[PDB]
Amino acid sequence: MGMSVADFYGSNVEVLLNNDSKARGVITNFDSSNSILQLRLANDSTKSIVTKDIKDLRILPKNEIMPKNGTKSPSTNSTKLKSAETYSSKNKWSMD
Amino acid sequence: GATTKEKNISVDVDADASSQLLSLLKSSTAPSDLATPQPSTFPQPPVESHSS
């Protein structure tokens, strides 16, 4: 039907600017009066860009954006920091 | 059975929606802004609801 940008706040998308340069990041804000868009990129960096310099916009795929794979990946299986005294391999239950 | 593409899934992400975001920044677009003038109404309620 039709939605406003407030629904797409926090969306990760890529944007090509009038100078044929590309930049992608997760949106944080947009001001109607000045049309000014803040993007918070996953490298812990903030960047404010005024939308008027946008030549074109596109939404990127969710996860696996840089790396290319052909698996469903139902679980993230991540263990960054926070370690316990238990180890798990493949799956806790097999042939169950 | 077997299909041409190994991946099918369902999800929701049409390539045409990306154009709507760039279309909004470029112009209002609205329901009509190109064909000849015609009798139409554009109500704008203060609050929108999906269920009632």
Q: Topology, pairings included?
A:
The complex is a heterodimer of chains A (96) and B (52).
Chain A: E1 12-17, E2 22-31, E3 36-41, E4 45-50, E5 54-59
Antiparallel strand pairs in A: 1-2, 1-5, 2-3, 3-4
Chain B: H1 15-26
Describe the structure.
The complex is a heterodimer of chains A (96) and B (52). Chain A is 0% helix and 35% strand. Chain A has 96 residues and is an all-beta fold. Chain A has a five-stranded antiparallel sheet, with no helix packed on it. Chain A starts with 11 loop residues before the first strand and ends in a 37-residue tail after the last strand. With 52 residues, chain B is mostly helical. Chain B is built from one helix and no strands. Chain B starts with 14 loop residues before the first helix and ends in a 26-residue tail after the last helix. The chains are: A mainly beta (96), B mainly alpha (52). The interface between A and B is medium-sized, with 15 and 10 residues. It is classed as rna binding protein/hydrolase. The entry lists the keywords RNA binding protein-hydrolase complex. The assembly is dimeric. Structural basis of the Dcp1:Dcp2 mRNA decapping complex activation by Edc3 and Scd6.
Summary tags:
heterodimer, A: 96 residues, mainly beta, SH3 type barrels, five-stranded antiparallel β-sheet, 0% helix, 35% strand, elongated, B: 52 residues, mainly alpha, Enhancer of mRNA-decapping protein 3 (chain A), mRNA decapping complex subunit 2 (chain B)
What's the short version?
Chain B: This is mRNA decapping complex subunit 2. The complex is a heterodimer of chains A (96) and B (52). With 96 residues, chain A is an all-beta fold.
